[PDB]
Amino acid sequence: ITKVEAENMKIGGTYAGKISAPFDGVALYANADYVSYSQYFANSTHNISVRGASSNAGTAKVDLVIGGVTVGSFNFTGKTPTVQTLSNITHATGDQEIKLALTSDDGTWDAYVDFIEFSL
Ligand SMILES: [Ca+2]
Ligand SMILES: [Mg+2]
């Protein structure tokens, strides 16, 4: 299992920044916010989990982008952190950018991101 902490990734956008609550991680608030890093892959398919939370009782949605492809979105509804999963995602091998960003600007609340975990 490969786990990467959001707070150790590149943080970009107008608003995004490291957080300590509701965990050590990064918050994403508006469309151009992101976290990213480069991951080497030997295999073309993984299960991907992210621990995250919403800023509010309602929904925050986070796109997962691998090598520029939006492969799916994690739904974090409510203030309590959960682990959300995208299973059996195929992608390119070798060095690939991994990026997390809000799915919308106005459609959803803000996302808190703790870590990402890849597994086979
Ligand atoms: Ca973390
Ligand atoms: Mg927002």
Swiss-Prot record:
Annotated CBM6 domain residues: 2-119
Superkingdom of the organism of origin: Bacteria
Positions with a binding annotation for Ca(2+) 3: 29, 105, 109-110
Annotated compartments: Secreted
Record: residues binding Ca(2+) 2: 5, 7, 24, 114
Similarity remark: Belongs to the glycosyl hydrolase 43 family.
UniProt free text on domains: The C-terminal CBM6 domain shows calcium-dependent xylo-oligosaccharide and xylan binding. It binds, next to the structural calcium ion, a second calcium ion that, in addition to its coordination sites on the protein, completes its heptacoordination through coordination to the bound xylose moiety.
Biological role: Cleaves arabinose units from O-2- or O-3-monosubstituted xylose residues, thereby assisting in arabinoxylan (AX) and short-chain arabinoxylo-oligosaccharide (AXOS) degradation. Preferres wheat flour xylan over oat spelt xylan as substrate. Does not display endoxylanase activity.
Annotated protein name in UniProt: Arabinoxylan arabinofuranohydrolase
Source organism of the structure: Paenibacillus polymyxa
Gene behind the chain: xynD
Residues of the full protein shown: 516 to 635 of 635
